[PDB]
Structures are given as C-alpha cells and as structure tokens.
Amino acid sequence: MDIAIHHPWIRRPFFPFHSPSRLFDQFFGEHLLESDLFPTSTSLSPFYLRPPSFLRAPSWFDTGLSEMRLEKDRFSVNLDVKHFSPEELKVKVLGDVIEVHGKHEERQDEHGFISREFHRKYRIPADVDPLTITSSLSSDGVLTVNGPRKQVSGPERTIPITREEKPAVTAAPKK
Amino acid sequence: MDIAIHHPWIRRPFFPFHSPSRLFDQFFGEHLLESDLFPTSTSLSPFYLRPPSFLRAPSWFDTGLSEMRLEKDRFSVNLDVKHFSPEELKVKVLGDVIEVHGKHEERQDEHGFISREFHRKYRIPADVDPLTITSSLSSDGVLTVNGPRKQVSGPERTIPITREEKPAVTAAPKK
Amino acid sequence: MDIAIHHPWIRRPFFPFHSPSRLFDQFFGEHLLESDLFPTSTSLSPFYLRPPSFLRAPSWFDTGLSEMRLEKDRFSVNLDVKHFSPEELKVKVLGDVIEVHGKHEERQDEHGFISREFHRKYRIPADVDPLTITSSLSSDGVLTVNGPRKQVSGPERTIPITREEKPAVTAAPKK
Amino acid sequence: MDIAIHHPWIRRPFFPFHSPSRLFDQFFGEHLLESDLFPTSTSLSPFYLRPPSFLRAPSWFDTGLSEMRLEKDRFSVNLDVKHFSPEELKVKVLGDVIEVHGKHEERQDEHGFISREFHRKYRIPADVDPLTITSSLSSDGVLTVNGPRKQVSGPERTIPITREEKPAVTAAPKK
Amino acid sequence: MDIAIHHPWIRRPFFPFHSPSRLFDQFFGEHLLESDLFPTSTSLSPFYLRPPSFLRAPSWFDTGLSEMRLEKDRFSVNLDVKHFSPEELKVKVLGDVIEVHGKHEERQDEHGFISREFHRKYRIPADVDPLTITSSLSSDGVLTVNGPRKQVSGPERTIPITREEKPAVTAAPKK
Amino acid sequence: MDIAIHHPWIRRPFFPFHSPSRLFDQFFGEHLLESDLFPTSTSLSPFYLRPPSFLRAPSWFDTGLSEMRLEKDRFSVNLDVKHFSPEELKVKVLGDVIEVHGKHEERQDEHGFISREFHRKYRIPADVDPLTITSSLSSDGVLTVNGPRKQVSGPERTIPITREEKPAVTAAPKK
Amino acid sequence: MDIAIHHPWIRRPFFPFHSPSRLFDQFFGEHLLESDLFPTSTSLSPFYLRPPSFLRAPSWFDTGLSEMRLEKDRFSVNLDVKHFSPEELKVKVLGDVIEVHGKHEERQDEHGFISREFHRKYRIPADVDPLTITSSLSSDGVLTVNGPRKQVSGPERTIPITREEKPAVTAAPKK
Amino acid sequence: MDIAIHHPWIRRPFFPFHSPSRLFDQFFGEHLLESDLFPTSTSLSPFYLRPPSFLRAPSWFDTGLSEMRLEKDRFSVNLDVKHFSPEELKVKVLGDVIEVHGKHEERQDEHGFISREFHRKYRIPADVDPLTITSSLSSDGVLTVNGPRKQVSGPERTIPITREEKPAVTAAPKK
Amino acid sequence: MDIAIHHPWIRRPFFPFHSPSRLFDQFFGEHLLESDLFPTSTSLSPFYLRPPSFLRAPSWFDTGLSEMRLEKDRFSVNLDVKHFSPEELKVKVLGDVIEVHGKHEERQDEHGFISREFHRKYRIPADVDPLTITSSLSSDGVLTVNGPRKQVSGPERTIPITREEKPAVTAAPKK
Amino acid sequence: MDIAIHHPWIRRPFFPFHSPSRLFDQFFGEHLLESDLFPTSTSLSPFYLRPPSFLRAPS
Amino acid sequence: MDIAIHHPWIRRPFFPFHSPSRLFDQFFGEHLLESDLFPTSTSLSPFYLRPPSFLRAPSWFDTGLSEMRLEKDRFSVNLDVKHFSPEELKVKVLGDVIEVHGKHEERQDEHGFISREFHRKYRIPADVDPLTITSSLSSDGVLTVNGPRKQVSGPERTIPITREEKPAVTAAPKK
Amino acid sequence: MDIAIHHPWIRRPFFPFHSPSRLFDQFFGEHLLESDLFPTSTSLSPFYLRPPSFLRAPSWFDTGLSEMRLEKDRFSVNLDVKHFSPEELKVKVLGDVIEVHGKHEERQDEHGFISREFHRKYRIPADVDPLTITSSLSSDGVLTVNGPRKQVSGPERTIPITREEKPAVTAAPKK
Structure with missing residues (x-):
C-alpha cells in the first residue's frame, strides 16, 4: 500500500x-x-x-426487493435425502427456515462403519409458513414440504440500544 | 483514568x-x-x-437571579466585634462591600501580649449603598451600618479586549 | 520562528x-x-x-483591469539596437510579444573578438497584433515596429485537468 | 495528576x-x-x-456491629407482588436470604403480550432462619414470610489458603 | 525466565x-x-x-563436623604409582596435603617416546602430620606414607580486611 | 544465561x-x-x-517396547478402598483404564462431617480388556477387577490433519 | 496485511x-x-x-503456442480509417507490425477546427511479412494490407549481459 | 565503503x-x-x-613447493658480523634456524660508549641440519656455518584440538 | 529556513x-x-x-554625527497642548529631554467624564540646556520652551564592568 | 558517494570559519590582485590598453 | 576502519x-x-x-613539464586501420587531438554480417597543429597524418566563476 | 558542577x-x-x-632551584634502625638514593614470632655520590652513610620519542 x-x-x-x-x-x-x-x-x-x-x-x-422474494408459486418444496433414513431423520420447521437432518449408515467395513448424512438449509420465507407448511417422507428418503406461502424473513443483528435523550455524564482533569 | x-x-x-x-x-x-x-x-x-x-x-x-438578590427589606445590618475597640477599629464602606477591622489586646501574659482581631467581609449589594450607608459603633464593639438599600454588585474579571475589525497579519516558511 | x-x-x-x-x-x-x-x-x-x-x-x-493595458494610443514601438546589425539581427513577432535579437562585433582585440548583443522582450498586447504589426529597420540599428493595436494577452499555466463527473475508486485495509 | x-x-x-x-x-x-x-x-x-x-x-x-443487626423484633416480613401470580411465582428461602420471583402478564396488545415481574432480594439474617421461616401467599400477590428470627450472615470472598509452614523454593541467574 | x-x-x-x-x-x-x-x-x-x-x-x-575428618585410625596411607619411577618420582608433604609426582616412560615407538605419569592429591588432615608422616617407596612404585595422625586443615580464602573503627571520608555534589 | x-x-x-x-x-x-x-x-x-x-x-x-507392557500374566488386579463404600462407590472400566470412585464418611464432628475418598487410576492395557474384565467388591471395600488381559493403549494427541494434495495460495505487496 | x-x-x-x-x-x-x-x-x-x-x-x-499464432489463413487485413485522408494518412509496415496514421479535419467551428484521427496498431506476425505485405487505400479511407503470411514475432526485453565466465574481485574489511 | x-x-x-x-x-x-x-x-x-x-x-x-626449498647444493652458509666479536658473539643452531648474536663496542665517546650488534635470522631448512651443521669463526667476525643439508621446516600454529567423537551437551529456555 | x-x-x-x-x-x-x-x-x-x-x-x-545634531538655531521650541490645562499640566525639563504632561476634561457625558491628555517627549540635546531653557504657557495650552542650546545627549546602557587586571579561578574533573 | 554522511562531515570542519560566503577564493584573490599590481612596499611595474566605453567618470 | x-x-x-x-x-x-x-x-x-x-x-x-611534452621531433604520425575502409572512414583533426573512425565489414556469416572498427584517440599537442597537420590514406587503411608540430593542450574543467568584490547577503533567526 | x-x-x-x-x-x-x-x-x-x-x-x-638542593654541608647522613640487625640489614646505594632494609625479630609470642622492620628512602642528590658515599653500622642499628656530596638527581618519565623528520601517511573515505 x-x-x-x-x-x-x-x-x-x-x-x-x-x-x-x-x-x-x-x-x-x-x-x-x-x-x-x-x-x-x-x-x-x-x-x-x-x-x-x-x-x-x-x-x-x-x-x-431483490433480497426478499423472487420466483415462486403454490409450490411444494422437496428436501434431499438420497438414501432412506425414516427413523434416522429429523425435519425441523423453525420459522421460515426448513431443514432436514438425516443420517444413515450404508457403507460398512471390517470394524469400521461409515455413516452418510444429508443436511439441507432452506431459508425460503416466500415458500414457507410454519403453520401450514407440513412434511411428507418417502421410502427412498425423498422429503417433501408441501403447503402455501407468501412472507419474508431473514435473521439479522442490527438493534442499537441505549441512547434515549435526557441522561449524560461528566469528567475532570487528571493524569 | x-x-x-x-x-x-x-x-x-x-x-x-x-x-x-x-x-x-x-x-x-x-x-x-x-x-x-x-x-x-x-x-x-x-x-x-x-x-x-x-x-x-x-x-x-x-x-x-439567585446570584444577585434574595432576602432583604429595609435593614440596618450589624458588624461583629465581640470586644470593644473604638480607637482600634476601622470601618470601610468600599462600594457594595461593608468591612470592619478591629483589633484589641484583651489577653496578656508575662512578656507576651495577645491581640484578638475581628474582620467581617460583607458583599451585600442588595442591602448596601455607600452613598447612604452610615456606621454606628457601640461601647461593646457592636457595629451597625444602618441605611436604605437595593442594588447589585460583584467584582469579576471578564473583559476580553482586542479584536475590532480590520487588522491583517502574515508569515512565511521556516526551518 | x-x-x-x-x-x-x-x-x-x-x-x-x-x-x-x-x-x-x-x-x-x-x-x-x-x-x-x-x-x-x-x-x-x-x-x-x-x-x-x-x-x-x-x-x-x-x-x-490594472494588469492588461494602460497607457497606449496609436503609434509605433521602437526596439533597441544601438549598433547596426542588419544581417546579424532577427526580429520576431510571436503573438502579442515583440522581440529583437541583434548581435554585432564592434570591439576587437589581438586574438579575441568581442561581440555585443541587444535583446528586447516586449509583452505589449494593447500595442501589438501579429497581423498588422510590421517591422522597419534603420541603418543605425534603430528598429521600429509600426501598426495599430488593442488586444490583451499573457502566458499563464492555470489549467486544472480531469475531475469530470462519474469516476469512483476504492481501497482496503493493509499492513 | x-x-x-x-x-x-x-x-x-x-x-x-x-x-x-x-x-x-x-x-x-x-x-x-x-x-x-x-x-x-x-x-x-x-x-x-x-x-x-x-x-x-x-x-x-x-x-x-452496625453491619449485621439493627432494628428487628418478633416479625413476619412480607414480600411484594402487587399483581397476583399464584402459579407464576416462586418463593425461595436460600439461607438468610429471602427472595420472590413472580411474573404475570397483565398488559395485552395486538400481537404482543406484556409481562410484569416483581423480584425481591432480602438479606435479613436477623429476621430469617430457613429452618423456621415459612411463606404465606395472598390472592392479590401479597407474599408474607412469617416466623421467628435472630441470626447473622453475609456472603464474602476472603479466604487465603496457601502458605502453611515448611515450603522452600529456589532459582538461579538467567539471560 | x-x-x-x-x-x-x-x-x-x-x-x-x-x-x-x-x-x-x-x-x-x-x-x-x-x-x-x-x-x-x-x-x-x-x-x-x-x-x-x-x-x-x-x-x-x-x-x-562432616567436613573435617570421618573414618581414620592408626594408619599408613599408600600413594599410587602403578609403574616404578624411583629416580623419576618426587613425594611432597606440604602440610596436611600428601602428593606424589612420578613419571616413567614405559611405552616406546619409532621416534616417539610415551611417558605415563601418576599424580595423587591427598588432603587428609586427620591422617597426616608433616612432622611424623614419612614416606616409603617400593620397587614397583607402591609409595606408602606411614605415621600417626589427628589434625584438621583446609585452605580457604575468607579474610575480609579493612574497617577498623574511626575512619572518616566524604564527598560533595557534582555534575 | x-x-x-x-x-x-x-x-x-x-x-x-x-x-x-x-x-x-x-x-x-x-x-x-x-x-x-x-x-x-x-x-x-x-x-x-x-x-x-x-x-x-x-x-x-x-x-x-518399554512403554507399552512390562510384567504381567493372568492376573485379577485389585482396586483400593480402605473403608467400605458399597453404595457410595462407582467402578468404571473406560477402555484399558480401570478406575474406582468411593467416598465414605467415617469421621464425624459436632456439626461437621468428614468424608474420605479413595480414587485409583489404572492405565493397564496389558492387564485390562473392557470386554472381559469385570469387577468384584468386598465388604471392607477391597475391589478386585478379575479377568484375562493382553493389550496396548495410551491416549495421545498427535494428529496433524489436513494437507490435501493440490492446494496453493497467493499474496501481494502491501504497506 | x-x-x-x-x-x-x-x-x-x-x-x-x-x-x-x-x-x-x-x-x-x-x-x-x-x-x-x-x-x-x-x-x-x-x-x-x-x-x-x-x-x-x-x-x-x-x-x-497460444502466444504466437491462432486463427489465420491466406489473408489481406484491412486497416480502419472511417473518413478519407489520402494525403493525410501514413501507412507503416515496421516488421510484423502494421500501423496506420490518418488524420482528417471533418468537423469545423467558428474559429476552431476539429481534426479526427484513426490509429491502428496491428502486431500480427502470422499475417504480416514486410517483404510481400503491401497496402491498398480506398476513397473512403478503407485501408487494406494484402499479401501472404506465416511468421512469429514479439518485441521483448530479456537479454542479460556480462557474466563472462572467467573474472574475479576481492575487496577488504572497512568501516 | x-x-x-x-x-x-x-x-x-x-x-x-x-x-x-x-x-x-x-x-x-x-x-x-x-x-x-x-x-x-x-x-x-x-x-x-x-x-x-x-x-x-x-x-x-x-x-x-615454492614455500619449502629452492636453490641449494652442498653449501657452507656464512653469517654476518662486520666487526669481530669472538668473546661477544653467540651462535645458535635451533633446528633449521641458524642465528648469530654478536655485539661489540667499536665507537667510543666522552662518557658514552657505543655498541654495535649484528643479528642474523636464517630459516633455511634445505640448508641446515642441527646434527651436522657446525660453525666456524674468523678473526674479522666472518661466521661460517658449514655442513651438508636437505630438509624442510617452518614453525606454524595450526593445530585444532578436541572434538573427540561421542560428547553431547544441552540447554533450556531462559531470560 | x-x-x-x-x-x-x-x-x-x-x-x-x-x-x-x-x-x-x-x-x-x-x-x-x-x-x-x-x-x-x-x-x-x-x-x-x-x-x-x-x-x-x-x-x-x-x-x-547624523545621530547627535542636525538643523537647529537660537530657537525657542514649543510643546503641544491643544486644549488649555494651566492647573492640570506639568512641564518637566529632565536634562536634554523636554516633556509636557497636560490632562483636561473637555468631553462630558451622562455619568461618564472624558479626559484628554497631551504628552510630548522631546529628546533635543542641541536645543535644550536644563539651566537656561525655561517654559512659558499660553491661555490655550500652547507651551513654549525658550532659551539657547548646543550640546549632545542620549541615554544608553553600554557599560561592561569587571575584568579588572589579575583575577584567576580554577576547577577540577567531575561528573 | 556518501551524500548523507561525508557531505555533513566535510562541512563540519569548515564551521570554525564558515558563515560569510560560499566562495572564499576570488574576492580575497582579486582584492590582492588589485593590491599586488600596485607598487606596494617596492616601486614601479606598468603596461595596459584602452577600448571604447560608456563610462564617463572612470575608464 | x-x-x-x-x-x-x-x-x-x-x-x-x-x-x-x-x-x-x-x-x-x-x-x-x-x-x-x-x-x-x-x-x-x-x-x-x-x-x-x-x-x-x-x-x-x-x-x-612531464605532463605536456616528452619525445617528439619533426615527423608524421600514422593512425591505425588494419583493414582498408576508404569510403567508410572519417579522420577528424579537432585541435591538438587526432582521431580516426574507420569501420569495414570483412567477416560475413549466413544472415549475419560482422563489422570491424578501428578508432584511435591521439592527444598529441606537441605533434599536432590543426592548421598544418594534414592526412594521407593508404590502400590498406594505413592512415598517416603528416606535418610540423610543437604545441601544448589538454581539456580541463577548472574554471571557478563568481566572487568578485562587492556582494553582501543577509539572514535572520528562524524556527 | x-x-x-x-x-x-x-x-x-x-x-x-x-x-x-x-x-x-x-x-x-x-x-x-x-x-x-x-x-x-x-x-x-x-x-x-x-x-x-x-x-x-x-x-x-x-x-x-627549590626542587634540587636546599640546605647541606660536608655532612655524613645516618640511616635509622632503632634495633640492631647487623646480619639482617642491607644498605643499598642506588645512585643518589640511599636506602636501608633491616628486619629483626624482637617481639616473641607463644607460637607467633613478631618481626620489626625499618626502611628508609633517601633521595638526597646534593648529599650523596655513590662513588664516594660509604656506610658505617653501629651495634645498636645506627647506620651512618658518610662522605662528600654535591649533585642533582630525580627519576622522571618525560621522554616523548618519535616525531622525527619526513614520514608521510594517508587514508581514504569509508563506510
């Protein structure tokens, strides 16, 4: 520089x-x-x-505008779980965020067992609504969250507190 | 700090x-x-x-307001000189400031003489006018500066002189 | 200082x-x-x-105003070449600037020849106009530029460039 | 300075x-x-x-003395919970410290519910004895801790441990 | 550190x-x-x-105590001179310190002669006494210092001289 | 230095x-x-x-070698719990590490109860095998972990990961 | 950084x-x-x-390879001179570099004449060969350099001199 | 520099x-x-x-080679002692180094006696051999060391000692 | 610089x-x-x-010369006091320096009195002689110092003292 | 070419007699020239010429 | 140092x-x-x-003396041009300095032509006089400058201008 | 300072x-x-x-003058040796410096023998002449150096060697 x-x-x-x-x-x-x-x-x-x-x-x-919604309709979003994990999967609808947590052990070794896991993070407000949005699982792992939509979300951390007129402070010379 | x-x-x-x-x-x-x-x-x-x-x-x-006048009426005021000092006292009315300077030797020792002194400093502009304020002395030392009143005073030192339209100065590089 | x-x-x-x-x-x-x-x-x-x-x-x-013209009329300016130098003089009319360059060897020594030179620099805009302003030489060296006048000139170097709406630059932290 | x-x-x-x-x-x-x-x-x-x-x-x-006991007698102190919170209040008698934690939602808005909370912190050793001091709640929230008293407490953190006769350490020049 | x-x-x-x-x-x-x-x-x-x-x-x-004497009795210490060196050995009884210096050339080469030397340093005060302690040499080099004993020695250098009551010396400011 | x-x-x-x-x-x-x-x-x-x-x-x-096994055979190691603590003891066989945690209050005072505790930490891989090694308790506290053996263990933290062939980075001059 | x-x-x-x-x-x-x-x-x-x-x-x-030739064939490149400048154009074939310098005044004002200029810089070695490559001008300014091709060029400055294997120096300590 | x-x-x-x-x-x-x-x-x-x-x-x-010998034969080198000093001269044959030390007082003053001295330092290995090389003196001081020769010498101080394979040292952090 | x-x-x-x-x-x-x-x-x-x-x-x-006298004659210098101040003026003849100090209150306001003052400082040696030079006042303030002259003056401060034959001092090393 | 070392180090020994001008070998040189060309102590030694000039008082 | x-x-x-x-x-x-x-x-x-x-x-x-002339007489110096280069040679007599510049291509390669050049620099004042010294070329390149001699030269740069009685400058304290 | x-x-x-x-x-x-x-x-x-x-x-x-001689005559100086030490005394006449070194053991203890010593240092050139000045000892220790005198001496170290004629040295810039 x-x-x-x-x-x-x-x-x-x-x-x-x-x-x-x-x-x-x-x-x-x-x-x-x-x-x-x-x-x-x-x-x-x-x-x-x-x-x-x-x-x-x-x-x-x-x-x-171009940071809230874009291209959507009635819809019925689908989560991704290549390999079935009925008992080993947990779908969570935390607000306008749809996530899937499925882990299944398909690969096996001598004394070592391999376990694959598929985790999707969908922050689709204009596609999800905690109330109506439900979930439907298939036998192959194909998860499908069906339901209407229309709304915007997005977790941020911009909340300046304090500063509210009246109070003040003071000081004095020293060293 | x-x-x-x-x-x-x-x-x-x-x-x-x-x-x-x-x-x-x-x-x-x-x-x-x-x-x-x-x-x-x-x-x-x-x-x-x-x-x-x-x-x-x-x-x-x-x-x-609360730095000029407060509780006054007609008054007569009274200085303090516990022990009489007729010839050894001097009352001075310097403007809106009434003062008394009396010194009398009442305590005596072997070869050492003690002398007490009473000095009052009154900054009462609201009840003092040098033009009409007089002074009366008692045989015990009780001084009384009787007279009318109503006035404001207070010696300060806030007189920023200089700077008064059309001056001009200059300078040049140095090293 | x-x-x-x-x-x-x-x-x-x-x-x-x-x-x-x-x-x-x-x-x-x-x-x-x-x-x-x-x-x-x-x-x-x-x-x-x-x-x-x-x-x-x-x-x-x-x-x-007091930096362009002043006391002019309708005459002819005279250059200075005290000693004749017809073939050794070159008059130049570069715009509103009349100059004369004449060099003649009048002083002579043993094996050293002295040569005197007269150079005038006239920046008279209100007295010169490259078009009409001509030049007449005398046999003694007296040069005289004749012609009308009226004009203002003066070579300066105050021409800031660039800074033309719609640029934009950027940077970033360093160490 | x-x-x-x-x-x-x-x-x-x-x-x-x-x-x-x-x-x-x-x-x-x-x-x-x-x-x-x-x-x-x-x-x-x-x-x-x-x-x-x-x-x-x-x-x-x-x-x-004036940091342990003061003015107490056969009492039955009472906590403060202006608004009733029977199921939403928890009284804790942690030693010589009586506290109350009651939170009730009395203010309501469109889609926002307001909840007020009253929390008292009593450090009265000469008024509390966890063994006997009990609690009695009212229908308005008026909590009342009744029982005898006489005791002194106060959580401090002044307990030097190290140093205990017969240690000895050593060192040597370095650079 | x-x-x-x-x-x-x-x-x-x-x-x-x-x-x-x-x-x-x-x-x-x-x-x-x-x-x-x-x-x-x-x-x-x-x-x-x-x-x-x-x-x-x-x-x-x-x-x-454990720095003067230890285990001794009617003795006759023996110095060490593996190889005989009657004419090439010099025993010295310097106080409570018995030493032997014997050098003999037993190893020989082409044009290089090797010479071995045995030097003992005995600081036995409780075993030596310059007066009585004598020396007896053998034909193999076995030296033997015979005689009584009982004594303590040990050359140290702890003699802090100076400072002896009433000196006097001073100085003055400087820069 | x-x-x-x-x-x-x-x-x-x-x-x-x-x-x-x-x-x-x-x-x-x-x-x-x-x-x-x-x-x-x-x-x-x-x-x-x-x-x-x-x-x-x-x-x-x-x-x-001399950091894995040493002198073992069939064995049936015994833990140490001087004072019985049947209900107050918990034996744990965490891999090739046998430990015992027993705490019993045998010493009593006025208002202070003393509680002694015996904790053994055995890291014997060539003596322990979690799969077969069991535990037997006595009425005096004498714990005895019986069973076969032969094995090597030892928790270390030497796993420098990453360096996945085909990386590379870049930089540039700064100030 | x-x-x-x-x-x-x-x-x-x-x-x-x-x-x-x-x-x-x-x-x-x-x-x-x-x-x-x-x-x-x-x-x-x-x-x-x-x-x-x-x-x-x-x-x-x-x-x-991809820094010498690419897509060329029997050609006849054409220079660019939107507006005709027969007498005011100069074509130069300096090696494998074809350039055109044409300047014509097409825009005119009160006392200010505008002059446009078209300058092309072609560094096509595989398209130019000083010998055969000629030039043909049109009446509209369309310049056309016709001729065969096949060649590689590129002016660089990488010629380290000296290091004439067989020298020597020395120097000495100083301060 | x-x-x-x-x-x-x-x-x-x-x-x-x-x-x-x-x-x-x-x-x-x-x-x-x-x-x-x-x-x-x-x-x-x-x-x-x-x-x-x-x-x-x-x-x-x-x-x-050109640092040992050069041009020699049988020889009978001669030392230099311009003025005779039979009793005041000392010839020394220290190995391959022949030297002569002769001092004689030939100049005399009032109360001051002058004494001249001639000292030669010959480091001729290929000319000297302590064994055979002898010395002969003349009545004028002309010394002559006669005898055979052939040999190389030269006292230098290049003998790096210690590094007796199989040592090792150690250190530790400090400050 | x-x-x-x-x-x-x-x-x-x-x-x-x-x-x-x-x-x-x-x-x-x-x-x-x-x-x-x-x-x-x-x-x-x-x-x-x-x-x-x-x-x-x-x-x-x-x-x-030019710093002592210049253009003078018999003369009879006159001081300046525009407005009369007979009783409020003081003429002082301090050596070859004639001065006048007159102050008169000619301007008056409500409760503020203005007072003008004229002060002249004449350092005319070749025009003043304390002895003869007198003063004459007019009714308008016109002061006139009449009398002969001839002499030079000028109060300066250039008198280097000490360094009066044979002194001497001494010193010594310090730090 | 130590400009930041020798330069300030060579002008240092000059300070004991540095302050007047940058050129010390021409005024004292010509001052002695006009004084040496004049019969001082001894006597006589001339030879010159005279060209056209504008000066009226001098020549 | x-x-x-x-x-x-x-x-x-x-x-x-x-x-x-x-x-x-x-x-x-x-x-x-x-x-x-x-x-x-x-x-x-x-x-x-x-x-x-x-x-x-x-x-x-x-x-x-030994820096102007030495061994000369009355002959003709001759430059050196091993190979003939009549048309490609230029002799210059710049004062007391005779120089020759002849370049001829005698070595030839495939597509590379070698050119040899002989340049002599003679600064012989006692041998050269531009006025009379001439030059004569041979068919082999042998250049010969003939003519008288006797003269001294040598271009130096020792002309300290400035300083000429009656200057004066000034300064003042700064910071 | x-x-x-x-x-x-x-x-x-x-x-x-x-x-x-x-x-x-x-x-x-x-x-x-x-x-x-x-x-x-x-x-x-x-x-x-x-x-x-x-x-x-x-x-x-x-x-x-007052640093060579002072008050002397024929004389016959005598050294001081309070206690006799005929065999234990050594008189040395080193030039114009007469000295005496006598040590005798007169004080005796248990196992410690005290020895007194008298040493005189006379630097009398005007009283001593090594050639004539002799020495005579008494039975009490009274040493007496008799003989003529007249002479001046005094060992000093003021001999600045070097600084001959025509040397020549040099140097050069460094860094």
Missing part, C-alpha cells in the same frame, strides 16, 4: 464523484433518519434512501 | 445528551452573541442563553 | 479580521464558482470575486 | 497524621494477627483492631 | 517459609557476630549459628 | 557430536517418512527410526 | 503444495538451463520447462 | 565467478577432508586441494 | 565580501581598542573605526 | 611531517595566490608552488 | 586573566621550544620559560 502511489491513484478515478460532503455518512444519515420517523409525503418507503446519483431525469432510491 | 475504561464508560450515560453538535460551544455561542447585540424580539433578557433542554412543553433559558 | 512569540504575536494584528470562516478558501471558493458558471444577475464580470471588506457603504470586487 | 501540585497538596492536610510507620499496614497487621490467634487478655474481640487514634482518654477499636 | 510465571511460581512452595525478615542476612548476621566475640553462655560453638527451623522440640544449630 | 559463557561452553561437550547436518530434524525426518509409507525391506518396524549413533558394530534403532 | 492473520491464512490453502524445495526457483532453474544448452534426448523443446504437477499419468511441460 | 556503490561494484567483476556454491568453504572443505584421510586413488598429495578453475584441458591443484 | 537552500544562497551574494577573517569581530575589535586608548597619530576620533571597504582612493571610517 | 587502530596507526608515519599548519591548504594557498597575480621577483613561474620539503640545500617547486 | 552556575562563576574570578591567547599552551610552547634549541641571547636558562605576569617592572621566568 505505497502511500506515495496508491493514495494519489486511488483518488484519481474519484474526482468526478468527490465533493460529496466530507461528512456524507452523517449528512444524508440525518435526512434518512427524518424520513424514517413519519411518512414524509413520499411514495412511502420501507427504507428507500435518496443517494447521490448522476441520473438527471429520474430520481434513484436505494432499496431491497 | 484508565483510557480503556473511563473513556467508554464516561461516554455511556452521555448517550441521552449526545449528538449536541460537535461544535456546541461555538454554534450556540454565535446565537447568544447575536441576541447580545440588539433586543431580538425576546422577552428582554440581560443574558438569557437558550440552552438544549429535554423540556418539550416549556422553553428554558439560562439566567442568574 | 519562536512558536512561543511569533505565533501569539502574528495572531495579534489579525484579530479584527479573525473569525473569517475557518474554511474561507472553500466557502467563498464555492460562491465564486457558482458565479463563474452563468451570469448571475450581476453587473457582469469575468472574475469579480466578492471578498470580505470593511467598507460598509460600497461593495468591493476583485478586479484585474 | 499534577504531580507538582496534587502530590505536595495531598500531603498537606496529612502532616498531623504523618509518622504512622512507613510500614503501618504490616506493623499493626502483625499485632492484629497476634490477637487473632489466642483470646489475649482483653474484653474479647470478634475482630476489634486497635487503630491509631487521637483520642487521649478512651481507647478506640475498629469494629462492625 | 518468564517473569510472569517463574516469579509467582518460584514464590509458590516458599510461602510456608516467607516472612523470614526482609533483612534475614543482616538480622541473624548480627546475632551470629555477637556470639562470635565472647563465648556467650551456650554449649560453646566453633561457628554454630542458630538458624530458622520448623523443629519445635529441639534447637538446631548450623555446624560442620 | 551469559551468552558469552553458556553459548561457547554448551557447545564444548557438543564438539565430538557436532556436524550432524544443520537440518538434522528434516533430513532424517524425510528418511523416516519414507519408511513409514511401505515396509522398506526392513526387519519390520512399527516406528523404528535410524538415529546417528557411535556404535560401529551394531545398528541402533529408536524404539518403544 | 495482518501478519497475524494473512500470513497463516496465505499458507493454509498452500498446505499440500509446499515441500517444493525452499530453492525451487534455482533447483528447477538449473535443470531448465541444462536442457537449454544441448537438445537433450526429448521431444525437443523451444523452451518447454518440466514443472511440478499432480498429474500422475501424463507429463506436463510449460509451453507457449 | 559506500554500501550503495562498493557492494554492487565489487560483485560486478565477480560476475563470471558467481555460482561458486554459497557454501564453497564447507562443500570443498569436506572433499579435501576426505582425501586427507586415506590416500585416495590419485597421484597422492601432501595437501593438494582440487580447486575450481577455468582451465578446461588440465586439472589444477592447490600446492606448495 | 531550508538549510539546503538558504544556506548556500545566503552565502552566494557574499563571495565578493568573503575572506573577511573568520575572526573579524575580534581582529578589528583589537585595532579599534588600541586606538581607543591613546589618541594615535590620526585625525583623532570620537569612535571612528577603520572598516573593510572597497573604496580604493579614500579611507572610510565608521562615524556618528 | 578501526577508529581505534587505523586512526592512531595512520597518525604514525606522519609525525615527521606533522606541524604543517592545521590550515596548510589555506596558508600556502594564499602565498600561491599572491605569486599568481604578478611576477614576484622569482625565476618566473607558470604555476610553480613552494611546497614544504625536507631538502635543506635546494629549493623545490611543484611543477609540470 | 552545575554548568549553569559553576561555568559562569569559575570564569568570573578569571575576569582580568582572560585574553591569554586561546592557544596559550601552543603559542608560548613554540617560543619556549625556540629558546630550548640554541642558547638565545639571554642570561642563560636551563628551562626558564617566560610566562605572562602582571609584574611591570621586573621580568619573571618559570624556574626550579
């Missing part, structure tokens, strides 16, 4: 984008925090944020 | 008071300087500095 | 100018860049930069 | 106490360890440590 | 010995120096020093 | 052993890795490693 | 690719230098370097 | 001498140590060492 | 002055100290110092 | 030369500059410099 | 002693070396060094 090369070079194809306020992360952060309080006469927004764009005719907004 | 403890800790209860503009001392300082020039349609105030408060209903303003 | 003297002293005859926006070079720089795009209802100005002045009655603007 | 101020100042109102043996923590520590072995001819002492005092007439001894 | 391991560990099996006076080398050193002057009321002592022991019933004293 | 003494001294008695290939740990390590793949026409070895020996006549090989 | 992360992580995926001789660049470099002298009994080699591969069945050799 | 000049310049004429094995002092040192043990099938060698040479036809070997 | 620029540059236009004796301040200082003792055969000198000059024909000397 | 050896050792064979004035380069440099101005009654001198010699009888002077 | 006190204070009493030539040790050293060669027209001196004195009337010179 030659500071005498990478610094002036990584700033070369940046000019036409520069002048975006030395405090861009806070400037726009405030405007996005204002529209996140009350529907500010906009076409509403789950979290649409007005970003700096070169587009002159249209107004672009940062959104998701 | 453990920088790895006091810093993140002293910055905890501060949450509800955070986001007070990184330049709070200058930002509000300018607004207070603007209202200190001409009575800006305010309820008239010597130095009502509008500070950041959590009060939603009422508007708070920084003021004095 | 006693930092404990020159710093607090140089910051003395500057108070009356102080508080001129810690970012004065960028603040006004933006306002000057805005008026440099389209004639903003001003009295029209190639580069009239509204600067901070103490003048309360009139509005001052940074000019440049 | 102002080592050139706090050091000589924090040692100012300390003179009249100075000369307390540079090794005060060990000197007196030995005398207190001697009286902690065998009941030395004194008015006994649970841990009364003869400290350096200015009292000339009486002899002061560091003691507790 | 692992100051963060060997230090706290080398101080582990040492606690039961700890508190042996930070100045143990000087404290006891003084008491041993006092009993080294005049035969203090004791069972006498060549250099018996009362050391800190865990023995409660008996009183231990640091002594020698 | 005087590097100016220990270094040249610890390299003195190494003199006649020096020159053992500066990369002895890798040189021989390779030859031992080659014989650890396929029985290389040797007298069959479990892990015999040809080490640098001074023996000229015989060829020495690093071996174990 | 976290040396405590990248280093161990840039050597992990390297895992089974290691053991390639700490001096791989010199070891193989010598074997490649030996086969570069005399055509060693092989299927010849322009510069085929036997590299370390995991291929067990076949023997891989570092080669070029 | 400009490291940025002498280093790359001193290795410059070393150009064609490079690649002499980074461990040339040890590599060849082993081969020379192997031929120094048993007379390996060669034209023998007093200490000839096969060195790296550019000679292609002949094989060069590091030898001495 | 670029030492790599200002140093060689500040020494550039100094060459034609260089070689002025590295100890010019002491060399000439001695010659000037010699002519300051006894009136050496010259045109005398109050303090004329022969400096290094380029003047070849005339001899230049460092003089004063 | 062994400052502790080379410094005291180098200063050994220099004592008998010592005391040559710590400023020898400037002391003598001044005396040589004085004799370089006007013929100082010496036996003339091109640049003879009186150096410090040990010769007591004669006076030595640093001179050249 | 506080450099901020001792330095300016140790140079204070040096005030009028200064100006003794910064190179006083060399300046006068040369003048003293000149008068040490040939007897320069003076009152003759052995080593009289004209030093800087404040004496105006007389001329002082550094001299010895």
